[PDB]
């Protein structure tokens, strides 16, 4: 499923993402926007280390979900990577929360650092009623 902007903002808010571990909804929106274009079935294979990024937040298989084909990988979210490709984003949200409970927080995603960090991200939630 490819979410429309405000549709996703409310979906994320309903899932408890607004201010989760101090991360505003606008930050999660900027993350999803730049990671997958709000596309839940997005996948990206990383030929360099044999891992794959899954879902709307492009969560990596080396540490977060199990896809069975990533060498020496772990599954901190205790989910099959398939769970991160559903139209329903509850599992991708549960896992994204797990990611940020670690030291780096939202900084875990390099795309967040490149396109969201120290930027004006208000524009992502404007008019969405969140």
UniProtKB/Swiss-Prot annotation:
Residues 1-130 form the C-type lysozyme domain. Gene3D superfamilies: 1.10.530.10. InterPro entries: Glyco_hydro_22, Glyco_hydro_22_CS, Glyco_hydro_22_lys, Lysozyme-like_dom_sf. Its EC number is 3.2.1.17. Keywords: Amyloid, Amyloidosis, Antimicrobial, Bacteriolytic enzyme, Disease variant, Disulfide bond, Glycosidase, Hydrolase, Secreted, Signal. It is found in: Secreted. It is an enzyme of class 3 (hydrolase). Its main location: secreted. The active site is at residues 35, 53. Pfam families: Lys (PF00062). Lysozymes have primarily a bacteriolytic function; those in tissues and body fluids are associated with the monocyte-macrophage system and enhance the activity of immunoagents. This is Lysozyme C.
């Amino acid at each position: 499923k490819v979410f429309e902007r405000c549709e996703l903002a409310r979906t994320l808010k309903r899932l408890g993402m607004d201010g989760y571990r101090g991360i505003s909804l606008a930050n999660w929106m900027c993350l999803a926007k730049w990671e997958s274009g709000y596309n839940t079935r997005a996948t990206n294979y990383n030929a360099g280390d044999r891992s794959t990024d899954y879902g709307i937040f492009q969560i990596n298989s080396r540490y977060w979900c199990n896809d069975g084909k990533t060498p020496g990988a772990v599954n901190a979210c205790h989910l099959s990577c398939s769970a991160l490709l559903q139209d329903n984003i509850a599992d991708s949200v549960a896992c994204a929360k797990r990611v940020v409970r670690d030291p780096q927080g939202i900084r875990a995603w390099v795309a967040w650092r490149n396109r969201c960090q120290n930027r004006d991200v208000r524009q992502y939630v404007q008019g969405c009623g969140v």
